[PDB]
């Protein structure tokens, strides 16, 4: 019933402001509990950030009280976080949660963001062709920022897939690869296609991988 | 602030046992009666999910697999039998005062019986070398420890420094893990050699399995 989802811009410059929204669906915000903000850091450390109540009272982490805000739309059943004048260490996977006094139950999706001066790119998306068991894949090649998202066959495939963590390559563009798995013999009669969604660059990409 | 300290870092448990994760309070979390701690498990690109509230308490919809003791300043999640599905990180968290703060984490990885790589090479596509760049993939699928040694040669001649490799977390089935490596080259030094092999060593393997493939 209970639902949470985070909205935001996915890249910000250093030094101006980010600004996030909570969608609450199945709950009303003013009905009980305190709505957090919580975020994530590259290297996994999670840090509460702060929160609004039912009531509007605001209660935030002494480390960021300087340029944290923590507001609402109840109207819209919304909650906001905006923190000024941002720099790298800023760059984190952000989530918003419930608290009732008892337990964390309720919590979004999480939303990255990356505090860079770099311009969005979206990815160009290359076939790993397949030439027993037999691999394919696709190379999500030359995008920014954080993430993209990759399924195969319209998500009808799912068995043996595995999509690799992207790497900073040295031009400061990420690549990724997503590879899957199937029957030698499938390969003359299965299509396949990876499906790839870069949202900040409103790129999505089907590139069919045909065997070479 | 309250300092929650985690321990062990990681620990690899085999299934049916018991993994046993401590997490200590540089003061009282207890407070009123009740001990503000709480218990999370967190797979890659998900949320955190919580397993125990209040220290002792299990969240509706997990396993009761999961239990959580203690009060003050000690607390420990004890997870009975571990299954493959439990590769995972784990975080403490209290809510005592403000600012609320959390554990370090903790990786559960699930022991398995030594796997071998399954080893595959991709040559770069036509359409990418259209763009001046050619990117060698090598794949080593299903493999168990994850501790791998990827090689690139070129015309029988070893390379270093231009290629990248990436993990990926413990498979939740079949506890195994999948390593890419990618060799980029301008399409211009792509053309000018012949053979393109990778050489992966894993104990796994009795002596290293190179595959290649002769560009045309």
Known sequence: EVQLQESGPGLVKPSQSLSLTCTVTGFSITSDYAWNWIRQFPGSKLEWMGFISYSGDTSFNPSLKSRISVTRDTSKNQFFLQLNSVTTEDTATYYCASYDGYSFDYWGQGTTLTVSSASTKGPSVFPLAPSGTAALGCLVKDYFPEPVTVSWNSGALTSGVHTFPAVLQSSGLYSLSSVVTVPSSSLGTQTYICNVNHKPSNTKVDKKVEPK | ?216
């Open chain 2, 1 to 216: 602030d309250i300092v929650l300290t985690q321990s062990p870092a990681s620990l690899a448990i085999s299934l049916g046992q018991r993994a046993t994760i401590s997490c200590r309070a540089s003061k009282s979390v207890s407070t009123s009666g009740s001990s503000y701690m709480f218990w999370y498990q967190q797979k890659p690109g998900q949320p955190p999910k919580l397993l125990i509230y209040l220290a002792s308490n299990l969240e509706s919809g997990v396993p009761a697999r999961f239990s959580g003791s203690g009060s003050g300043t000690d607390f420990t999640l004890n997870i009975h039998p571990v299954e493959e599905e439990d590769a995972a990180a784990y975080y403490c968290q209290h809510s005592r005062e403000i600012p609320y703060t959390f554990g370090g984490g903790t990786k559960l990885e699930i022991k398995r019986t030594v796997a071998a790589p399954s080893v595959f090479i991709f040559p770069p596509s036509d359409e990418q070398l259209k763009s001046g760049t050619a990117s060698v993939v090598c794949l080593l699928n299903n493999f168990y420890p994850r501790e791998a040694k990827v090689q690139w040669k070129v015309d029988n001649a070893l390379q270093s420094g231009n290629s990248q490799e990436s993990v990926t977390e413990q498979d939740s089935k079949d506890s195994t893990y999948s390593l890419s490596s990618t060799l980029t080259l301008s399409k211009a030094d792509y053309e000018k050699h012949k053979v393109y092999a990778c050489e992966v060593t894993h104990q796994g393997l009795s002596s290293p399995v190179t595959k290649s493939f002769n560009r045309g």
